[PDB]
């Protein structure tokens, strides 16, 4: 499982964004419809791929047939079968957050997951609320503004 994380990270400009994969890092910035989820080549993914049902779920690397691979997303055969849940999010190789469907259950609330601060640094000053989601009633922690 842990060997199934696409880890093709590349800091073309040494801006320090890659530190957020191991730990939160002092960060500040002034500058701070999605397409359907298809098959994402693992070569262009850096870090875990999260999908929301609306609960966050880690999607590891698999081949195009769905068999789990354990090559850290370095082989060309490794992809992410994301066509199913409501949306997925991940980091590309050059530090851009990719979405498809994302974790926005409300125009101002978002599902909270371990790598939210990394994928969406804009939401660092958000408050975590235990909100209720109607899908059956599901309750989950959400970072809201």
């Amino acid at each position: 499982h842990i060997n199934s994380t696409a880890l093709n990270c590349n800091e073309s400009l040494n801006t320090g964004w890659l530190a957020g994969l191991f730990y939160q890092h002092k960060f500040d910035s002034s500058g701070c419809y999605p397409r359907p989820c298809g098959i994402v080549p693992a070569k262009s993914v850096c870090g875990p791929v999260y999908c929301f049902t609306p609960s966050p779920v880690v999607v590891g690397t698999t081949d195009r047939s769905g068999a789990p691979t354990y090559s850290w997303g370095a082989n060309d055969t490794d992809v992410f079968v994301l066509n199913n849940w409501f949306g997925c999010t991940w980091m590309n190789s050059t530090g851009f957050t990719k979405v498809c469907g994302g974790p926005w259950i409300t125009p101002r609330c978002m599902v909270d997951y371990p790598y939210r601060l990394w994928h969406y640094p804009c939401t660092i000053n958000y408050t975590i609320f235990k909100v209720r989601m109607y899908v059956v009633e599901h309750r989950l922690e959400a970072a809201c503004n």
């Epitope: 060997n3 994380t5 880890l7 590349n10 320090g16 890092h25 850096c46 370095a74």
Partner: antibody, heavy 125, light 106 residues
Amino acid sequence: LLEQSGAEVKKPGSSVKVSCETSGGTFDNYALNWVRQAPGQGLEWIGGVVPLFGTTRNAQKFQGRVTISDDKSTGTGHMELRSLRSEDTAVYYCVRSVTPRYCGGGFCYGEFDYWGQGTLVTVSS
Amino acid sequence: ELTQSPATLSVSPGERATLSCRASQSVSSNLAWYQQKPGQAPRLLIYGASTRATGIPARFSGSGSGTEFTLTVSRLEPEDSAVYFCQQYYRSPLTFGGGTKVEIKR
């Protein structure tokens, strides 16, 4: 500040293990590598380990006879070099990197932020 | 594989010392500069070819990309007598330069 063990003297073919402790509390670093410098040569990278993923990388001169570990609870790194030869007489340094700059499955590289004072390992008969 | 020329240097205080680091192959901006005072642990000066590390005074300045790199220590002071070496982190294995021992005149 990184503090390393005292100097060592070993017979050829033996094994040496060098520790690397942190002066203060454990801090944020993603990888632990080891570097040595022979008396007439420049600095040489030996290997490294990224504890979060459990992956390791070695140089070809050390494949099969080197083992690098990093205890995150205590903040103490380790390097055991086996099958020692006289070419291994060098000052061995301990490094810890804080900001990764490139990751290839499943290892991550970058500049070395903190260095240890060094440990002389002499291999002689 | 990195190459540093010259191997030694001798510059007067308050002047400018220029060091070089040639790369046999392009390493982009994945290069770091270090300072090793005699009998001390090496100290990171520059990373990313041209970015100073935290706590590094502004008189240290690095530049270059691809295969050519240059470290510049302006307003040289006696505490700058040390060995400086470059390191690339663009490809495995990680390689260091031969070093450049600097003597401060007086």
